[PDB]
């Protein structure tokens, strides 16, 4: 699963991870298949327009990672 996907089962969460992963999903041109945090950064850098701040996207990478680690 990319952090794309993860982020969409985030959607609908009553806080500010719920709310960037809205913000993510409305966002057209988001890295759809990336997994890499460098990759990832560079294009919120870049081409990120969100509400919130950067902190909210390294919380919710880090919460990916942690999440990929209870499957597997």
């Known amino acids: 699963y ?3 996907q993860f982020v969409m089962t985030v959607r609908g969460r009553h806080d500010d991870k719920g709310r960037l992963a809205e913000e993510i ?3 057209l041109a988001f ?3 990336d997994d890499d945090f460098n ?3 560079d294009y919120i850098e870049t081409h990120g ?5 950067m ?3 390294d919380d919710l990478y880090e ?3 942690e999440w990929l680690k ?3």
């Not at 327009?49 to 701040?53: E, I, K």
Request: proline share 8%.
């Open 55 to 57: 902190s909210v996207f």
């Open 63 to 65: 919460e990916y990672t």
């Open 39 to 41: 990759i990832l950064s």
């Open 2 to 4: 990319s952090f794309y």
């Open 25 to 27: 999903f409305d966002d």
């Open 70 to 72: 209870f499957l597997e």
């Open 49 to 53: 327009d969100f509400t919130l701040p």
């Open 31 to 33: 890295p759809k298949h």
